[PDB]
Design a protein around this ligand. Structure first.
Ligand code: HEC
Ligand code: HEC
Lengths: 127, 127
């Protein structure tokens, strides 16, 4: 869906920015600094589920650019494993949110965040 | 969910960029220049449905910035009507996509695009 590589870059950056807002806005809830409304979090995690599937199709071959390491492209199976571990962690977060369980939510949230960081450290250029 | 107004601006710009990609990527299909796969379009419109609900909460009071006209804020009921007409046009597009009907899809797509343009012309600063 991208006319030029720059368009894929802009899409994935926007997707990741959203995904990041929908993940990070739950930090006060997971920490107890904001109240836990199970329905609110269920709905937000559904949004996050949708968003978390979107970035990956915008790293199609030859779309080097942005802060993406070339290592994404030449190690496709392995990048795919990082992506797929992250979404299976998102599945677990959805299960916790759907269950309405703050303890399970906190644990699952931590696992997701670790998976964000794992891909970051391997595949996101240093600033 | 935004620490500063700039964060709301960046969120809504990213949301709108996505929404725009998920809408615009269907143009070749609606024009017949690309094949029509009813399941593909159903799935894409579902993504668009999710995305099309997201920008509006990131124009919360005092979040003037970006290309948003101040007119969004002082005319809240009316901006809300433009937003709500646009999503009711998205509901119609979902119905067309779920029906698997290229004629209904084309008509509904045109209506959505008109609603994008209506809000654009009223509420998006001139470049
Ligand atoms: C888990 C919920 C997260 C969160 C919070 C973020 N990511 Fe990543 N990310 C990855 C790569 C390769 C990039 C660079 C993309 C490019 O510039 O071409 C990024 C970038 C980001 C950003 C910045 C986006 C921007 O506006 O420029 C942010 C805020 C971000 N990420 C947050 C790679 C991955 C992954 C590889 C499989 C995974 C998993 C994640 N990111 C997960 C997350
Ligand atoms: C219907 C599917 C669309 C499409 C394709 C786009 N919009 Fe809009 N839009 C609105 C406002 C106020 C802005 C400015 C936001 C800001 O800068 O603070 C925008 C911006 C955009 C963009 C640019 C985003 C960016 O990356 O900077 C794009 C690509 C875009 N729009 C496409 C306002 C509205 C509406 C008011 C109710 C509606 C409806 C739409 N936009 C619909 C669409």
């Amino acid at each position: 869906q991208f006319a030029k590589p720059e368009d894929a870059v802009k899409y994935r950056q926007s997707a990741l920015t959203l995904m990041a807002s929908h993940f990070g806005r739950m930090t006060p809830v997971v920490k107890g600094q904001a109240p836990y409304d199970a329905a609110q979090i269920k709905a937000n995690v559904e949004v996050l589920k949708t968003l978390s599937a979107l970035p990956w199709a915008a790293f199609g071959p030859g779309t080097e650019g942005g802060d993406a390491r070339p290592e994404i492209w030449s190690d496709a199976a392995s990048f795919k494993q990082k992506q797929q571990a992250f979404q299976d962690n998102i599945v677990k977060l959805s299960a916790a949110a759907d269950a309405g369980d703050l303890d399970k939510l906190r644990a699952a949230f931590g696992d997701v965040g670790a998976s964000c960081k794992a891909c970051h450290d391997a595949y996101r250029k240093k600033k």
